[PDB]
Design a protein around this ligand. Structure first.
Ligand SMILES: C=CC1=C(C)/C(=C/c2[nH]c(/C=C3N=C(/C=C4\NC(=O)C(C)=C4C=C)C(C)=C\3CCC(=O)O)c(CCC(=O)O)c2C)NC1=O
Length: 153
């Protein structure tokens, strides 16, 4: 469970994310795709990208980074009271995109990595711990819905 203070550490770094949503999204997705190349196979509009220059230049990759973070910011601002936001997301991720829980872990690691690289002044152990707990909660609740829907991924 996060304290209210921990939720505010999460929202304070998220306000900095929102000052450059596209830049943070490209950094997060490039980190993920280079760390875990198979994850890129899920994107038919841009699965052929190979170099960092091609990734940075892609409009589809930039737009998907913004989609991810628009949705994740909305979830985080609910401070855990997020079933409404999670419901449509678990729905597409279990029945259409088929995104394994291990992939949700991989992008959570990428988010933490980029936030820490871009905001070391204040993304310290407490804020990193709070973000870790909020993403763990996110993954916990998506997984519970996956299993309700019968997706074992
Ligand atoms: C905090 C993480 C995270 C969030 C909140 C997120 C949101 C998110 N992913 C989306 C699409 C999608 N999401 C994925 C893939 C993924 N989705 C994943 O969670 C992971 C790890 C992958 C990839 C390995 C794909 C393939 C689409 C469709 C992209 C498209 O057709 O344009 C959409 C569009 C609407 C929908 O299909 O439901 C949203 C809002 N994606 C995320 O990554």
């Amino acid at each position: 469970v996060l304290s209210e203070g921990e939720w505010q550490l999460v929202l304070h770094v998220w306000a900095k994310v929102e000052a450059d949503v596209a830049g943070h999204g490209q950094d997060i997705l490039i980190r993920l795709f280079k760390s875990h190349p198979e994850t890129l196979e899920k994107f038919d509009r841009f699965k052929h990208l190979k170099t960092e220059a091609e990734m940075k230049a892609s409009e589809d990759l930039k737009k998907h980074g913004v989609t991810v973070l628009t949705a994740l910011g909305a979830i985080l601002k609910k401070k855990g009271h997020h079933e409404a936001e999670l419901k449509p997301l678990a729905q597409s991720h279990a029945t259409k995109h088929k995104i394994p829980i291990k992939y949700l872990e991989f992008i959570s690691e990428a988010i933490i990595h980029v936030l820490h690289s871009r905001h070391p002044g204040d993304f310290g152990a407490d804020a990193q711990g709070a973000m870790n707990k909020a993403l763990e909660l996110f993954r916990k609740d998506i997984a519970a819905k996956y299993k309700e829907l019968g997706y074992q991924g």
